[PDB]
Amino acid sequence: NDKDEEIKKLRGFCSRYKRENASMKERIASCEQGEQENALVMEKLMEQKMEDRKIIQSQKKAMRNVRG
Amino acid sequence: SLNDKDEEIKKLRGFCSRYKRENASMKERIASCEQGEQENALVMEKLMEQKMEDRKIIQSQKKAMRNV
């Protein structure tokens, strides 16, 4: 009766923990997937920004060349 | 107070501490992922603002050259 209750209690924690852990792997996995998708967007936006700065520099030079 | 029960309890107690450690680490990892995702959103917002301002500068440069 004393050993039986402790066993019932511990089994309950184990089933609880096990359910919560399974749920978290699922959540962690979708998070990492979100982050992989974010990475592609960020990379594209960063390339475009640097490409814009390149154009700006090239145009700043062309005007410098015209003002001689 | 049956026969395999003291050991069964010892094993289950072990699983619980193990589950408890693994649970804590996952909570920590999910929070880091979510913080990463929040930061990413902010970076993209900054990058989008910068592209738009850069395009403004680029158009302003092409027109100033047109006007010479």
TrEMBL record, chain B:
Location of this chain's protein in the cell: Cytoplasm, Cytoskeleton
Protein origin, superkingdom: Eukaryota
State the family it belongs to: Belongs to the TRAFAC class myosin-kinesin ATPase superfamily. Kinesin family.
Q: What is this protein called?
A: Kinesin-like protein
The record lists the organism as Caenorhabditis elegans
Location of this fragment in the whole protein: 532 to 599 of 775
